[PDB]
């Protein structure tokens, strides 16, 4: 017919290249439902994510644009691989959906947290996140939204990061949730939490909303420094400064031996170093928090360190693009469209 065709997966219509068969729903990442599919040409499992009229709204479009450009221009063993993009509508007039085809991993970290890792796994996984993160950063991209749902792993122990349709609940760094102003290590809090979660084997802060975290968080790490409170908005300083005050617990009492696996044959892969790294990462005040390089140089992580993994040449953006403008509906559509057509 016209290369495309249509299946109903529940209430959603996927329209895709005939080469993509046997679609199964596998989940929904921020801005789109995603199908697993068999790719008849490559002879390979793939993943198809659909963004239905992504130009709909200011929010949506900003993110979809970011995601598009980024997914093109960024390439690395620890960042989900792009394989194909398309719309099945044959004109800018008639264009409404975008389809991004990616590699299919086995699972999201949700997931690894659940099971009982040895140290070389915990470390290696973490090393892989950090390396992927260093890559994004080396081109001034800051993810701001790293969490287990948006990080995927394979049953050969590789890990890749999904998502920049947010990149530029309590996994987000405080500097971020407190409208505070941020920097690259805003992504290191994310990792600190995730590692913390890997060790504990479940949720780190048994806390519901995007400020019921806060209390469970401060309850445990302890109320942040006075001369960090300044840095806050008077709007916000009031709220924080008003909360009860907590001493916190040591990292030994928060992450005690019993929770870690046996100290490995290897020198540096020990609960005392893991605890060390963690306590340098899971810090509330960003200017007191370790950077990605330091985390990479840290005895727990550096055992895998590989200059050719970690020091790849940055992606290069046009910096013409860096969402430095808001737009109207029409323009976005055109932009996305240009961008998608550019990707065919």
């Amino acid at each position: 017919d016209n290369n495309f065709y249509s299946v109903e997966i529940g209430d959603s219509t996927f329209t895709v290249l005939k080469r993509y068969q046997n679609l199964k729903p596998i989940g929904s990442g921020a801005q789109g439902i995603v199908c697993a599919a068999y790719d008849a040409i490559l002879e390979r499992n793939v993943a198809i994510k659909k963004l239905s009229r992504p130009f709909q709204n200011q929010t949506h479009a900003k993110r979809a644009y970011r995601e598009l450009v980024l997914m093109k221009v960024v390439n690395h063993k620890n960042i989900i691989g792009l394989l194909n993009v398309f719309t099945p509508q044959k004109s800018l007039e008639e264009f409404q959906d975008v389809y991004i085809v990616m590699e299919l991993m086995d699972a999201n970290l949700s997931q690894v947290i659940q099971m009982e890792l040895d140290h070389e796994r915990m470390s290696y996984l973490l090393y892989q996140m950090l390396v992927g993160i260093k890559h994004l950063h080396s081109a001034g991209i800051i993810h701001r939204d790293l969490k287990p749902s948006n990080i995927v792993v394979k049953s050969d122990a590789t890990l890749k990061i999904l998502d920049f349709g947010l990149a530029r609940r309590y996994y987000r760094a405080p500097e971020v949730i407190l409208g505070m102003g941020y920097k690259e290590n805003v992504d290191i809090w994310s990792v600190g939490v995730i590692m913390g979660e890997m060790i504990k084997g479940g949720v780190l802060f048994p806390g519901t909303d995007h400020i019921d975290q806060w209390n469970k968080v401060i309850e445990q790490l302890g109320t942040p420094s006075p001369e960090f409170m300044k840095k806050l908005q008077p709007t916000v300083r009031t709220y924080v400064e008003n909360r009860p005050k907590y001493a916190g617990y040591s990292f030994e009492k928060l992450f005690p031996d019993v929770l870690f696996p046996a100290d490995s044959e290897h020198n540096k892969l020990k609960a005392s170093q893991a605890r060390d790294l963690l306590s340098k990462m899971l810090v509330i005040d960003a200017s007191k928090r370790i950077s990605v390089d330091e985390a990479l140089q840290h005895p727990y992580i550096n055992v895998w360190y590989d200059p050719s993994e970690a020091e790849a040449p940055p992606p290069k953006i046009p910096d013409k693009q860096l969402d430095e403008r808001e737009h109207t509906i029409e323009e976005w559509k055109e932009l996305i469209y240009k961008e998608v057509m550019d990707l065919e």
């Binding site: 086995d106 699972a107 099971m115 792993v153 049953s155 050969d156 122990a157 892969l269 895998w304």
Partner: peptide, 10 residues
């Protein structure tokens, strides 16, 4: 210190 190559997704 060798890189793991398996990971059990049970």
């Amino acid at each position: 210190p060798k890189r793991p190559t398996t990971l059990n997704l049970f």
